[PDB]
Structure formats: C-alpha cells, structure tokens
Design a protein around this ligand. Structure first.
Ligand code: SF4
Ligand code: SF4
Ligand code: SF4
Lengths: 198, 58
C-alpha cells in the first residue's frame, strides 16, 4: 500500500479527481460544505488546517496554507483523525455517580455536587490538566487550581515525566516564545535530535 | 347619447347570458400547461435503474 504518514497531501495535491479520499468519497460537493480555518489538535506542530463539515458532521480537514508553520501539508493523523468526537462514546450531558452507577444529570445538580465535593476537599486536591487543552483551557485549569482550590498540584503531563522535566521547562521553555522557528529549522546547518522522532 | 356611460351595464347583462368560464376544479380541473413547473419527479431507465447519480447538481 501507499503507506505514508503524509498520504492525504496527495489527495489535496492532485489537480483532478484521480486521487480521492476514501473517507470523503461521495460525501459532499463544495457548495454543501461549511468551511472554517482551524488548527490540528494532535501534536505540537500546530498546522493550519481547513475543516469542512456538511450536515454538522466534519467530512475532511485539508492542509490549509501557513508558510511559517506547515506550508500546505498535513499528516494523516491531522487530516483524518477527526471522527473521535462522534464515535458514540461522547459525553452528551453532565453525569453523576449515584449508587455506584454513572447517571445523566442536569448542569445545575452536577455543578452543585461538584462544588460541594471540591469545597469539602479544600486544598487537598490536585488538578491533572492533560495535554488536550487549548491555551485558554490550560489557563483556566491552572487558575482554578490556584484560587478555587488553593493548591499548586497542577500538571498537564499525562505521560511519562519527571521533576527534572518541570525544572527544565521552567528554566528554558516557559515564557520564551518564538525563539527557534520552523524557518530557522530549514536553515540550521546542524540539527541534533534527543529523544525525538520527528 | 349618454349611452356610452352606461356601456358597463350592457357588459354585465351580456355576461349573465354567456356561459360562466370558471374551471371546474377539483371535479373538473383545468388544463395546466405542458411546460408547467409541477412537483419534481425522480425518473428511471426502462430497466428500472434510478436515473439520479447523486451528483447534487440540482
Ligand atoms: S471528472 Fe472530476 S477530475 Fe475530471 S474534469 Fe470533471 S471534476 Fe475534474
Ligand atoms: S496535521 Fe499532522 S503534523 Fe500537523 S499538527 Fe496535525 S497531526 Fe501534527
Ligand atoms: S442533478 Fe444529480 S443528484 Fe440531482 S437529480 Fe440529477 S442526477 Fe440526481
């Protein structure tokens, strides 16, 4: 098989219908698509993408165009890994534990119970923020931990990690925006990779 | 003769002896033009296959 992590680009690069996406096959015509700019959710590459949805369902995610980040390319993960939100496991309503069973609940009741529990726990709480969060979402999680819980037990690392990692991120990464850039990568005479499979 | 001003009467009286022209819908519906834009219809080939290819051009 074709077998490339970037195969979808060919579908987007073909100037004709010769190469088509099997997932998108016969799904819609251009006029039937609501098209929006977007960013991929999957890795730190942050590629510009174009999400196309018909009938409220996302049908494809084209590569977009951002010369400073991704030129006009994707990987298959970014281009096609969008169905996760509609596989039928999505949480549609707030859920509450009662009698050991997870039951659908209102927003009012759910917030009541969550506030009760969190106030009962007070500072004996820790917030695992995970890595699937927008900058705003992470900021809200952190601020919520700092004030609403009066705790510093905040970690977005849902993965193997270490204290040395947090120390390094504080020392060199955090607060240091827009240093090395993709454009710089292209011209770096020598690139070394430590624990990194690009 | 002042009669011209009364021509309308001659009209209405005359019409009440010519036959009414109303179409008899629904017992006797009127003839709609052959080209009329009636309800869309999806057609088939003589073997029964649906003509529509789902191109969404319509
Ligand atoms: S058949 Fe498809 S690829 Fe060929 S001209 Fe028509 S739209 Fe383009
Ligand atoms: S398109 Fe591919 S490389 Fe770009 S952010 Fe998404 S998963 Fe990462
Ligand atoms: S335009 Fe295409 S989709 Fe619409 S009725 Fe004709 S063949 Fe079918």
């Amino acid at each position: 098989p074709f077998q490339s992590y970037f195969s979808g680009n060919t579908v987007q690069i073909c100037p004709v219908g010769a190469l088509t996406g099997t997932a998108y096959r016969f799904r819609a015509r251009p006029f039937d698509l609501v098209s929006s700019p977007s960013v991929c959710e999957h890795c730190a590459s942050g590629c510009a993408q174009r999400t196309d949805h018909r009938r409220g369902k996302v049908l494809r995610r084209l590569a977009g165009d951002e010369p400073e980040v991704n030129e006009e390319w994707n990987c298959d993960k970014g281009r096609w890994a969008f169905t996760y939100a509609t596989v039928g496991d999505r949480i549609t309503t707030p859920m509450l534990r009662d009698g050991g069973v997870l039951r659908p609940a209102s927003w009012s009741e759910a917030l009541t119970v969550a506030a009760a529990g969190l106030l009962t726990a007070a500072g004996s709480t820790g917030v695992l923020v995970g890595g699937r969060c927008t900058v705003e979402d992470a900021y809200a999680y952190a601020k919520f931990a700092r004030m609403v819980l009066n705790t510093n037990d905040v970690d977005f690392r849902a993965r193997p990690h270490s204290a040395e990692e947090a120390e390094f991120l504080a020392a060199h990464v955090a607060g240091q925006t827009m240093g090395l850039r993709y454009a710089e990568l292209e011209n770096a005479p020598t690139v070394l990779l430590a624990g990194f499979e690009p | 003769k002042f009669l011209d001003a009364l021509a309308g009467f001659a009209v209405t009286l005359g019409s009440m002896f010519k036959k009414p022209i109303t179409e008899g819908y629904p017992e006797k519906p009127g003839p709609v033009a052959p080209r009329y834009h009636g309800r869309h219809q999806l057609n088939r080939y003589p073997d029964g296959l649906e003509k529509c290819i789902g191109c969404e051009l319509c």
